[PDB]
Design a protein around this ligand. Structure first.
Ligand SMILES: Nc1ncnc2c1ncn2[C@@H]1O[C@H](COP(=O)(O)OP(=O)(O)OP(O)(O)=S)[C@@H](O)[C@H]1O
Ligand SMILES: [Mg+2]
Ligand SMILES: [Mn+2]
Ligand SMILES: [Mn+2]
Ligand SMILES: [Mn+2]
Ligand SMILES: [Mn+2]
Lengths: 194, 409, 84, 140, 394, 48, 49, 42
């Protein structure tokens, strides 16, 4: 229910050769930056750390990885870390990895790499799993929150901070996800196959 | 030449105080140059200082931008030296009714070196009261505001009458207007000037304006020939390029002086010629110019190179997979400019009382490149941002050094 | 060498089409070189009640170079107080 | 947060179940809608509360919320009015002991209101280095 | 009292220049009042004017806000009048490096009435500084850090009289810890008059308690508070008198702003002082009252048992209208003199009515739209946007 | 009429519907195109 | 304006035609979501054009 | 093109007025009866 610390590497503007870290303090954690200084990138990584879903229409073209040209190396490795305390007293740490390659062509291919979930037990470390699909399920359960909420409420994009005050039908659309209404609507549609 | 019958005038323009106010390495080049101009005014014993315009770069300057301009004026324009000028023009016609008297005619401020100015494009009237940034200075008593144009349609231009001994001076002011709007007013002949008539002559005439000189659009530029013939010398206040040397226009019969800015706002060939401010000495119907270079200006060098016709590695970069070598040539191009840039700075400050105290700044470099090639060929272009980044600590404009482009036909 | 642009307008006509209006020249007045007390009083600058008042102002008007009034300030140093 | 259960047009062979969602305000008897008829400051405070309130309803265990430039596009009077508003929320949730609020703002004026309260130990910052790579520092 | 030893100080505060100058009717409300303050300064022959602070409403004052404050100061602060104030503190200690010397010591700008103010805002440079560079207003009261509190009084003298002017600009924890340290002259000690002006920090969260300050002071000035209580009062615990100058224009329509506003002339002789209040004329008239619908005798609850919308408006007209009756009369009483020689036009008074429509039971008082109700008085009230605010007790 | 309703005479703060969020942006184009009415003819003839 | 024509999902026997729209800004080859910037001038200008 | 723009910003409106390509701007004002009226001004 708490999140402990974050660490970024090679995401958007953030440099790929040196990890950057930020620690969150209860109750409030502040972040101020000059215009166009990568203030919003911190939030994006926090989202990808938990729900394991890249920003919208950004997974093509490596829009979420430090562009390879800036560093100057055809290969770029991006890493995201997240330390948190489960609903139970225990606390774990999460990691994910992305890789992007520049071929001879301007075109570039986004490749997903292995991640893991680590158990930081007292004077001990254990590996919980290494399959992201599972880790997506694991992470959500540890946080004690379901994935639907984080999509549209907890981590809100900058422009749409006023989604509750949007066009009413546009206001309607989001709740359908928030309620997780769609899973059960297609269960009814499975009763239409009947 | 200084004498009881001679009036010395200092000329400056496009000082653009505040430009790049928040760059980490180039924050204090905007005003420190300005703070040096006035220091010249007090040192050189000039009668009065005439600012071409664009005193402030931003319409609403920040406190820091304003604060340093007022500080410099106060130090170098107030003193026990008595003014040697006589103000014959009616105070009410040109100035505000709040303080109709000229600033140095005030009883409560000991003005030593009056400073005259005209508002520029980046300092046009705005806000509730049609106030321009200068207006704040004028009420403070440090700057004389003139050449103001209240009605854009009916342009009325009254000179300021100044006399020192037998030297009689007339100062015609015409502040910034939308470029092609002034094109149109002069065309319609609606504009007029008001000559002195006490002698009906023997009056020197000086005009300062802040419009563009030449532009592609036929209307944008205010053609030189449209000015009357009775003028003697004109202060062209917008073109940042420096051509301090006056030149007599044949058809008209007057000289043209184009000062140039004090800082280089846009990295282009024009703003590469060394910067200067002029000392304009007037006596009778005669004038003389003594150009003074500025020492504190940031150095600057610009080179134009077209890859296709470049002798250096003309065909050596034609081989396939030319990206490591392409940068290799350029690294040798820039480093020469860096050396050349650091050479000029040393030349100017070769000998000075504070030469040891002063520290060398980081010269500005800009290398504009055209990389169009025949279809069967091509040159690889590195990332512009990274290409410059490798010079961190060697050039003030770290973010950009080169600007690749291909000509469009 | 010079750049010439043919706008096809008679500059000689323009010069004579310009209208010049005579502007009166005002007579000069002293720039307060050394204004006497009666001058200020006549102008209403000086209030007779101010006469005899001590002045600590170090101000000097222009043209008063010969006459200098000295101002001496005895600076009293401050002491940190034993705060309860 | 009002809703209409019967927002479905009758279909012969389709459930087509979509529930309308429309949030409205109340002043005395009047219940006019807030899309319009309200100032800029009113909306920004409105959205934050909904995100806040909505979160606990579904989970009630995680007090994590992430506002982004909430104070942006506000006149002078509202931002301080906004600032004190946030102050009440955190104090109210402070007793509960479950709220991890992250707020991002690039206005120099707004930030000082919260830190002046001195409940937050420190604030972070993001800067561009010589190579234009983001860096993170801790400042008290 | 006006002698060779008496020192006259004109105390003001919270002039909030530029406050709501976007509105058409009240644009001239703010800076015009400030002008009247200085006009009193020169007319009443003061020796220094002490601004309580908040000279500007907005941390980034608009040009027209600044232009008119500088215009006002130049006409009134600068003059041939001699200054009878002798400066004894070292300039370096309590002034910025640009121009450490007090302004009226400057050899190039004569100052008839020096202006002492407190710091306005921090964004190094503050709003006031633009004035100081021009030399119009002297500065003091700056504090470097919350932890490091060091107050350097400015010592001034006129004839025999001796004055000390402590400055404490702009947190509650520090004072309790006793980090604050005051410098007090121990030479010729006991014959220094002491005056402390403090402007409580706007953004603190928590206000200075009168018991925290030392016991050697003589008079104190609270700046932030806007309600006007000009006559000084003595706190038995502290042992010194306190004065609350109060604002110059009603920034927030509340009961406090109702009381008439004044600026005092703080005359000081020896260790004792006398104060006399000058009513401020140009201030916009302001009248406010609160009426509870249920308890109102005038209504007698003829709405409770019946429909209300139609006649409720009728009810308030008689209440709002009569407020304007005394709104102008008090203005008229203060403007009887001079036979309206200047500003003959009658400004539109400000009216605010605080109604609670709590219903006992089974009753539904009808409430009209605020804006529609307010604008009905267009041409009779300046604040056409809102004239009444309706609220129900919770 | 779809263009008249959505594009031409835009509502004040809705002036930025080109910058409303993707799903709302999508609800708006589908209106302008007059596409929803011919999706209805397809689905009717599909039931045929 | 990047209208996604591949957003259409394949039904068991039907086309189920539907196009998903999102407006983007292009700087050279790179293309960004255009959402989240603070250039209100750019926002209003782009809406207008 | 017959673009229509609504604004009450002195800056934004003066720019286009001085552009000389706008013949005039209309106005809306609340009369003594608090009723809207349009008066043409150039
Ligand atoms: N692939 C990329 N490679 C390099 N830089 C990138 C890449 N994608 C985005 N950026 C830049 O990284 C920065 C990220 O800034 P953001 O966090 O999106 O916005 P911001 O910093 O919050 O500024 P605001 O909020 O509008 S004031 C911007 O300067 C982008 O141009
Ligand atoms: Mg952002
Ligand atoms: Mn310029
Ligand atoms: Mn210019
Ligand atoms: Mn106040
Ligand atoms: Mn205050």
């Amino acid at each position: 229910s708490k999140i402990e610390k974050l660490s970024i590497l090679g995401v958007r503007s953030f440099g790929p050769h040196h990890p950057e870290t930020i620690a969150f303090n209860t109750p409030l954690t502040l972040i101020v930056g000059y215009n166009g200084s990568g203030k919003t990138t911190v939030i994006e990584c926090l989202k990808y750390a938990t729900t394991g879903e890249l920003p919208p229409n950004s997974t093509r073209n490596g829009a979420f990885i430090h562009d390879p040209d800036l560093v100057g190396e055809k290969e770029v490795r991006a890493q995201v870390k997240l330390s948190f305390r489960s609903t139970i007293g225990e606390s774990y740490v999460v990691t994910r990895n992305i890789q992007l390659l520049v071929q001879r062509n301007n075109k570039r291919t986004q490749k997903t790499l292995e991640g893991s979930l680590l158990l930081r037990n007292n004077g001990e470390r254990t590996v919980i799993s290494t399959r992201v699909a599972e880790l997506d399920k694991l992470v959500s359960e540890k946080l004690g929150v379901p994935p639907a909420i984080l999509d549209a409420v907890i981590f809100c994009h900058q422009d749409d901070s006023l989604w509750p005050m949007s066009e009413p039908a546009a206001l309607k659309k989001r709740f359908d996800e928030i309620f997780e209404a769609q899973k059960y609507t297609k269960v009814i549609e499975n009763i239409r196959l009947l | 030449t200084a004498g009881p019958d001679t009036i010395r005038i200092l000329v400056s323009t496009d000082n653009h105080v505040g430009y790049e106010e928040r760059d980490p390495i180039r924050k204090d080049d905007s005003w420190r140059t300005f703070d040096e101009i006035m220091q010249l005014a007090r040192t050189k014993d000039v009668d009065m200082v005439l600012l071409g315009g664009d005193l402030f770069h931003d319409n609403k300057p920040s406190r820091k931008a304003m604060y340093q301009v007022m500080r410099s004026l106060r130090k170098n324009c107030l003193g026990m030296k008595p003014c040697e000028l006589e103000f014959l023009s009616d105070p009410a016609e040109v100035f505000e009714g709040a303080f109709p008297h000229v600033n140095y005619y005030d009883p409560d401020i000991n003005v030593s070196i009056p400073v005259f100015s005209i508002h520029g494009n980046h300092d046009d009237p705005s806000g509730d009261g049609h106030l321009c940034s200068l207006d704040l200075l004028q009420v403070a008593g440090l700057v004389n505001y003139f050449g103001r144009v209240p009605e854009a349609d009916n342009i009325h231009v009254k000179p300021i009458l100044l006399q020192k001994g037998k030297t009689k001076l007339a100062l015609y002011g015409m502040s910034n207007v939308r470029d092609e709007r002034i094109h149109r007013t002069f065309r319609d002949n609606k504009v007029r000037f008001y000559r002195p008539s006490q002698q009906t002559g023997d009056w020197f005439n000086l005009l300062t304006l802040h419009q563009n000189h030449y532009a592609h659009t036929p209307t944008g530029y205010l053609s030189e020939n449209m000015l009357p013939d009775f003028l003697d010398l004109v202060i062209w206040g917008h073109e940042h390029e420096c051509l301090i040397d006056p030149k007599k226009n044949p058809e008209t019969g007057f000289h043209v002086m184009q000062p140039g800015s004090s800082i280089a706002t846009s990295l282009v060939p024009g703003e590469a010629v060394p910067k200067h401010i002029a000392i304009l000495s007037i006596t009778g119907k005669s004038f003389e110019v003594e150009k003074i270079p500025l020492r504190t200006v940031r150095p600057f060098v610009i080179r134009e190179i077209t890859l296709a016709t470049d002798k250096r590695f003309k065909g050596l970069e034609k081989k396939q997979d030319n990206r490591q070598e392409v940068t290799k040539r350029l690294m040798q191009i820039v480093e020469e400019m860096i050396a050349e840039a650091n050479e000029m700075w040393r030349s100017l400050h070769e000998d000075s009382q504070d030469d040891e105290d002063e520290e060398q700044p980081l010269p500005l470099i800009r290398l504009k490149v055209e990389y169009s090639s025949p279809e069967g060929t091509k040159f690889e272009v590195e990332n512009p941002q990274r290409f410059s980044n490798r010079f961190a600590g060697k050039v003030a404009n770290q973010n950009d050094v080169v600007h690749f482009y291909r000509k469009k036909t | 060498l010079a750049q010439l642009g043919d706008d096809d307008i008679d500059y000689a006509a323009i010069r004579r089409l310009h209208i010049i209006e005579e502007i009166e020249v005002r007579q000069p007045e002293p720039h307060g070189p050394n204004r006497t007390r009666e001058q200020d009083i006549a102008d209403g600058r000086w209030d007779p009640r101010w006469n005899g008042r001590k002045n600590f102002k170090r101000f000097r008007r222009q043209g008063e170079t010969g006459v200098r009034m000295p101002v001496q300030s005895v600076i009293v140093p401050l002491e940190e107080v034993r705060t309860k | 947060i009002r809703s209409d259960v019967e927002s479905t047009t009758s279909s012969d062979s389709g459930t087509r179940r979509n529930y309308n969602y429309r949030v409205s305000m109340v002043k005395g008897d009047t219940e006019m809608d807030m899309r319009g008829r309200c100032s800029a400051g009113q909306k920004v405070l409105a959205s934050i509360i909904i995100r806040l309130a909505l979160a606990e309803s579904f989970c009630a265990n995680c007090g994590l919320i992430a506002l982004d430039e909430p104070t942006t596009n506000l006149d002078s009077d509202n931002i301080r009015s906004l600032a004190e508003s946030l102050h009440g929320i955190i104090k109210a949730r402070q007793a509960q002991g479950n709220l991890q609020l992250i707020v991002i703002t690039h206005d120099e004026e707004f930030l000082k209101y919260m830190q002046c309260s001195d409940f937050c130990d420190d604030f972070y910052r993001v800067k561009r280095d010589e190579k234009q790579n983001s860096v993170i520092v801790r400042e008290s």
